[PDB]
Amino acid sequence: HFLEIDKKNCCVFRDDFIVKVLPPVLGLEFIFGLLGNGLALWIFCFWKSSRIFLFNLAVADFLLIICLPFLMDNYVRRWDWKFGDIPCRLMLFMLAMNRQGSIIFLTVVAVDRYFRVVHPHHALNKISNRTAAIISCLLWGITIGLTVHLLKKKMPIQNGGANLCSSFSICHTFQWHEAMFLLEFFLPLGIILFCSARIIWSLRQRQMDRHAKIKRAITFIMVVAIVFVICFLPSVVVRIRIFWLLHTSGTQNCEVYRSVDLAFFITLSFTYMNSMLDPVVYYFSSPS
Amino acid sequence: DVQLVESGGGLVQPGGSRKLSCSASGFAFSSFGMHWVRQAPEKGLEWVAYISSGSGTIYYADTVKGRFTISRKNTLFLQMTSLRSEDTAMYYCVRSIYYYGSSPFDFWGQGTTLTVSGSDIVMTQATSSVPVTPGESVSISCRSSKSLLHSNGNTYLYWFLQRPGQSPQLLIYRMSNLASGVPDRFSGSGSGTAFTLTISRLEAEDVGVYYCMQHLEYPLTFGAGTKLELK
Amino acid sequence: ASIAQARKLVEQLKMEANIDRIKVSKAAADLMAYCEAHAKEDPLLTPVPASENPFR
Amino acid sequence: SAEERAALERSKAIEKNLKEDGISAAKDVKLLLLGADNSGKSTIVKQMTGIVETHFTFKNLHFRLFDVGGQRSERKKWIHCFEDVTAIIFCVDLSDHESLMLFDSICNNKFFIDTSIILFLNKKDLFGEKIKKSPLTICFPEYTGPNTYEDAAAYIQAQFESKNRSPNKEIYCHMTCATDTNNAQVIFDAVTDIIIANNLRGCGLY
Amino acid sequence: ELDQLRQEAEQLKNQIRDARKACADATLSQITNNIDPVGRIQMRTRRTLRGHLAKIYAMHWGTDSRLLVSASQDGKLIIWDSYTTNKVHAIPLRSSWVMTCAYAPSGNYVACGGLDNICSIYNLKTREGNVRVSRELAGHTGYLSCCRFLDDNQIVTSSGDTTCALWDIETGQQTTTFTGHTGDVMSLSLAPDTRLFVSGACDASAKLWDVREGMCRQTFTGHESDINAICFFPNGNAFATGSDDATCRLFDLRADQELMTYSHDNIICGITSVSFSKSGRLLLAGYDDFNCNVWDALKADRAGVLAGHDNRVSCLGVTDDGMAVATGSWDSFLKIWN
Ligand SMILES: CC(C)(Cc1nc(-c2ccc(O)cn2)no1)C(=O)NC1=C(C(=O)O)CCCC1
């Protein structure tokens, strides 16, 4: 495999192990995420600042899983994106906007929890629904502008006899695509860990952890960060391996990249398991 | 008691500048809107400037725009600049409050004498002077170019009485409602475009000059004034 | 003390029992007649058109 | 429009005044103060026929205490006015029985199934002096234990705590000797715990 | 002595019951069975009076049928221009715990009261332009639950100390006291001619008070719980009392007994307000179930539901001209229906 795009050499593979392993996992994730967050949105529709942030996160995950069946069709036909130009530019943009929105609203929910537990009397805890709504709309605008630059590109890309609709192609140059993919994990992970640790310590130091409700309110803040870590870390370490190999050995011979590329596309499904495991923040530990 | 007293009169050279200040006491000055109304030495009233409560909106007459400015410690100010020869007049300070059932222009100041070295609603009073005797009944008529009966049902004609040597006092507001403290003998009539103030069993205390004012839209143009003279 | 309270209660009952009472038929018929006579002047039971409704 | 423009100006101005007043008042912490007569409510009020309001400021919170016990009328027709109080402060005089019935009535009320009560056991030293001459049997005939402060006071506190049934509330008991000024700090701690619990509830986590 | 008085009182009660049963030769439904039903009387929210930041406990229309006064536990009594939703006045109460309010028939004065045991008469036509207290009426031993002007000079108030009183606002002292209720007098309603009035009390009884001589004239019973609201039928010869027993009943003054009972098996919430349409055919009642129902007063069946509130409705009132009905609720919104 070899390719040339954006005035730079690239190489992307089409191994059948993806066909062997991935489609059942992707279909199960799609069905489970639909059954979860569609019902969650139905409940939300039929408010407080935390509630509308949670609704925004649900919207992001719902849009992601709505994009997903097009990726089902893409994988099922071996990266022969027969849909063409405009559906490719729409799909890539919307997927990459939905992930960054899901990550960012997870982080904002964690920050809201931190301000609700660590600084209860701070004025941020009594903001009106209008202020929360405008903050959510501004954050949506940031997420949309952070990716709309990728919509302009003239998709799709021809490689051999297959018409690929992808952006994670491996090669020796840099796009904002990679730096922001690796910061949207690292920085939100830092904020998540800081907020969760502060909430846990504040609850325990105050000697009310012994309460049954505040005995699950801690477990359920720990497992949020654990779910975030499991869901995103493998793809980010595998792409770090991609970067390491590119910097140390270059792309003069891409034969050594088959296994790691397969691992990369097999681990990104964990960013979708984020979407199927999403109702841990909506359903469980809540009375409603 | 309720008092509006102003200061800052006297001689001024043409083209100069002067401050006219209105001092209010005995009422909630902050909640009232305030107007300036000036009277030529031998003519009728003319509206000058309006500043609303909280200084939200300010309006000026056509012949005043750009030269004067109105500002409001419970005091109101008129900064007058580039005085013409025609700006000589007695300047009254008028309060007004607007809400459903309110009575704008209810109280008028005493006035300061100041002397120097086309789409608006024109309003006319047909008779310059009406001779009358005590005990009889008189009738002052007033008209407007544009109908004052607004869509919401209110007609915005106002009637004022100015006794000789005294400031104007509100008699009828919105063309039918008798002002507070005014004797019942007065009454407002007419609708649409022609209005009439009826005085029944007139007394010597009602001798003076009667002005009709519209409030539908700025500028608030007064009538020429009908003088009710004794005998 | 209870004697005076009981006397007051029995006096109230005595002044209350002597009140003249008309039959339920007459009172019900008069209420129905009042409701009928003013039916045409009730904007809530006869819906008011938007042309004259002040809350349109 | 006509001078109705100025009427709308006035309406908007007083609407702005109403929000500003609401914003200013939102920082207050409302607390309902209850108890029997001479139970120590006025004692803590001094230390720190209509309704009586007592207000004090502690660490940037404006606590408002309503001593509604002065109402000589049935509670159930006006107790719904205080359904939005942050917490209920219940005062008990250990040196003095109907307080248990009152506490059962108020803790299990329809409007207060989600409002946590703060319980103050005043007159601790007077109770300690009293127990040296008589044991709780006079106040609690079913009491079967040693005549000791540590056990008798704990038994009384248990009797009070036994009256709640709704799991969604907590009882913050404390014991005041009528000489300590720490009651303001105790109320602050209880109120802030209640507030963070309510925030965790309002974020769907509690 | 005591036994003789008690026995004579019991005999008087038996005599009254026998007379009332002898008067009841028919029923309201048995006569109005031939009356055509009013059908589904539906109406929509025409205005939403936003601005209260706390639970609303009372609302009263002015006699001019356009201005409405609303009182809320936030400590503000706001006068609304219902045609344009504009707020005319915002009156800061001296105490936040308001339970009632009233609008003078002339529109000059507004009254307020609550747990203060004090009724405050505000003056709206002050020469100084601001709204200020004219008189503060004190003397009740319990919370004032309702107050109604007879005119600008005198006001009648009901209180939780079982006493209704008639005040002379010019001097600020009670002119006449009405005694006889066992529990709190939670409601009151002056007759259209203002010659006499009724009061609904928590001992499940409504008494007909006459203003002038200050003595009870008739007493009505039949409710099994506290009466939360009461209202005269427009003819002035009947009144409807809404109780906490999830039912409201129509009483006749001349027949001295109940006529119809408005209840439904799917209703368990207690009444909080009761009012009649201008003709008296529709009886709109507020419920603790966040809804308000319209009852055909002559047929005793529902004609519609004014379900538009997220919390219990605490006050309701039909305009003097009958053009609209306002409902106040604990959700801090007052909605105009038509
Ligand atoms: C477009 C994308 C997401 C790669 C990319 N995203 C961004 C970006 C940059 C900044 C930012 O804030 C957000 N996103 N830059 O590159 C991509 O190729 N995705 C693919 C899939 C997926 O990821 O689901 C499914 C299979 C096909 C490949």
Author numbering:
A (entry chain D): 9 to 54, 59 to 300
B (entry chain H): 1 to 72, 76 to 120, 135 to 248
C (entry chain G): 7 to 62
D (entry chain B): 6 to 53, 183 to 230, 245 to 354
E (entry chain A): 3 to 340
What does the paper say about this structure?
The Hydroxycarboxylic acid receptor 2 (HCA2), also known as the niacin receptor or GPR109A, is a prototypical GPCR that plays a central role in the inhibition of lipolytic and atherogenic activities. Upon activation by agonists, GPR109A couples to Gαi sub-family of heterotrimeric G-proteins leading to lowering of cAMP response. Here, we present five different cryo-EM structures of GPR109A-G-protein complexes where the receptor is activated either by niacin, acipimox, MK6892, GSK256073, or MMF. The comparison of the ligand binding pocket in all five structures reveals that R1113.36 forms the most important residue for binding to the negatively charged carboxyl group of ligands, niacin, acipimox, MK6892, GSK256073 and MMF through hydrogen bond.
Several non-flushing agonists, such as MK6892 and GSK256073 with high affinity for GPR109A have been developed and characterized using in-vitro and animal studies although none of these compounds are yet approved for clinical usage. Moreover, MK6892 exhibited higher efficacy in G-protein response and similar efficacy but lower potency in βarr recruitment compared to niacin. Analysis of these pharmacology data and calculation of the bias factor suggest that MK6892 and MMF act as G-protein biased agonist at GPR109A. Like niacin, acipimox, MMF and GSK256073, the carboxyl group of MK6892 makes similar contacts with the surrounding polar and hydrophobic residues within the orthosteric binding pocket. MK6892 has a relatively extended chemical structure compared to the other three agonists and therefore, it engages several additional residues in the receptor. For example, the extended moieties in MK6892 i.e., dimethyl, oxadiazole, and pyridyl groups interact with Q1123.37, H1895.39 and M1925.42 in an extended binding pocket in the receptor. Interestingly, several conformational rearrangements in the side-chains of R1113.36, Q1123.37, S179ECL2, and Y2847.43 are also observed compared to the other agonists in order to accommodate the bulky extended group of MK6892. Furthermore, an upward rotameric transition of H1895.39 and an outward shift of M1925.42 is also observed within the extended binding pocket to prevent steric clashes with the extended chain of MK6892. We also observed that unlike other agonists, MK6892 is able to activate G-protein-coupling to R1113.36A mutant as measured using cAMP response although it fails to elicit measurable βarr recruitment. Based on these data, it is plausible that additional contacts made by MK6892 impart a greater potency and efficacy compared to niacin, although follow-up experiments are required to test this hypothesis.
